[PDB]
Design a protein around this motif. Sequence first.
Motif: not given
Lengths: 174, 174, 174, 174
Positions: D43-53, D159-174
């Motif tokens: 899972x770490x690699x799967x999130x690292x892949x999102x944060x660093x493409x 840093x890249x986790x925060x900024x990518x999470x800040x611009x994130x779609x449909x976490x949960x309701x709203x």
Amino acid sequence: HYSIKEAMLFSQRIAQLSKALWKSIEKDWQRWIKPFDLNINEHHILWIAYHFKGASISEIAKFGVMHVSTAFNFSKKLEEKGLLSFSKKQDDKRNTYIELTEKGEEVLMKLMETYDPTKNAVFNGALPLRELYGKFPEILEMMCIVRNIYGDDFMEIFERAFENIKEDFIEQDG
Amino acid sequence: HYSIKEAMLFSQRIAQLSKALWKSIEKDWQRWIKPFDLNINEHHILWIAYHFKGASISEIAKFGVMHVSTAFNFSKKLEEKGLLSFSKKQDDKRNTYIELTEKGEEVLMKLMETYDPTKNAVFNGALPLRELYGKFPEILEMMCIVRNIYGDDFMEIFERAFENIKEDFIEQDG
Amino acid sequence: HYSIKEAMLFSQRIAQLSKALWKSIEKDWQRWIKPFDLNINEHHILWIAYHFKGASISEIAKFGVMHVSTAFNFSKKLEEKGLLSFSKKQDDKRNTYIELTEKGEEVLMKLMETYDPTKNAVFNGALPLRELYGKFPEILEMMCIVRNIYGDDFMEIFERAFENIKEDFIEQDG
Amino acid sequence: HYSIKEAMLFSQRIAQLSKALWKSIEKDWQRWIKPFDLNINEHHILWIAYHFKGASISEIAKFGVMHVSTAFNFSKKLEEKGLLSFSKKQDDKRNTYIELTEKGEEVLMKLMETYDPTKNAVFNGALPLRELYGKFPEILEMMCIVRNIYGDDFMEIFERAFENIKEDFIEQDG
């Protein structure tokens, strides 16, 4: 469950540290505001007036950490400059309320045009801790005591100061 | 690399927090020392005299966060009570040195016999943070700035205050 | 009153920071204990046995952050070395209790004779923060969460570790 | 200038605190990711892949606090699911590079749809400290050591986790 010794140690610790913090801020605050012939308590009211537009002098006293008597005298000397205005509420109000003026706002703005954080001492002193943390020290340990004393209503001045400063015009170049 | 906005936010943060800390300590400090007709700067010298037995009024000024002129006047009013003594060094010394008296020490002791930390505000306000940490808050973030400003020689007052307080007689019962 | 966003930010923060802390401590812990052919969980029990002389394997599991099943297997492999001993209580006890041996204690002592904090990573990494604070970081923010999770009974291992380490013989030269 | 005693005290402090933090995060992390038959390193690699493409498996190892050998095996088992893709660079490259897939991204999204911070332990444990500070603990003391060890290049994942999470779609309701 608490030693009187560890209490005295704590008190001597924070009493020496607090006096060093206020006295150094006093010197840099006064030098910044003295070109307009004002004191730190008067400027406090002028910023409290920006952050809370219409507030009783009693609230000015709470947010200003001043006596009600003291806040009255400085607010009255501020109206007698045109840097501030006074209002009285309807029905039956003992309280006297306070607002800023365009002359008063512009004075704050030309002070903002002269804000050099380099000259302020605590700024340079906090540059080391900022480099290790990435951002300015948030001194949460201190902030907890102050809320646990002055009240949450007192602490709301930081929120409104931040949000109003976030939506602020022409601090300096850019 | 630093925003003027985050600077102003920091300054307004610590300036409001420092004024709240000194003003609340002032009230509890003065009430504690007023039964002996002394002010916080005079008492500061009386404790500085215990922690550093023979010090120039210039050092008293540095440790006391006072002007040299201010420390002179209060030290002289203290000698004129018998709570303090003055000395002059050999060879050629412009400096005037300072020691405590048995009357001056005993005054500190009867103040120690009246130290109720319950009445002091910051004490009760720090009881929450002490329960979560197990011990009184050490506010290291603040302590770093003050050293980075006043100097390490200034900070040595905490060490000598702690060690002298650790070897202290009859604080209260037990 | 809490954003799911600020939660995820927090979780990703502490999850990345905790994995970095354990993995780096693992490497320095294992290199220190591998010359005696032991793992970090076995050594944990050997130090838990010194700090709490007679404890149920269930308590060893709580203090060791191990499963009860896991603590049993390693304690049994430790008795089969002579580094540890087992005991059973009177009346009716399902629990199996544990004590150290002179062979087990001496193994801890010769490990203490080989403790080079220079080689340990977090030690050198905390030298910067120690110089600014005067003493090693006390990471109270972390310590509060762990107590608020594992329990105060779990946290008492730090107290007994400190006091037993304070009264300790021949760590190294002097 | 440093006691071996205060070193051992520090080491036993942080070693017990770090093991408690990782083991409790492990349990809540695994329960969250086990419904998709993955481990924390995958899972770490799967999130690292999102944060660093597009990152070398060697960088995946540094950000993942994994061995290069370990990161290879899990990344290869991830490609063999279609949750990840592999690429090779031009000229002459020994390195093997990594990207995410739409199947891999969607797996992260349906995990995000199941993020209950209530079940996670450290979340509830940090609710006390958040109420006193107003916001989640930032544990800067810990964060300083980790940077002072792993490097600033490692720390950029926050840093890249925060900024990518800040611009994130449909976490949960709203």
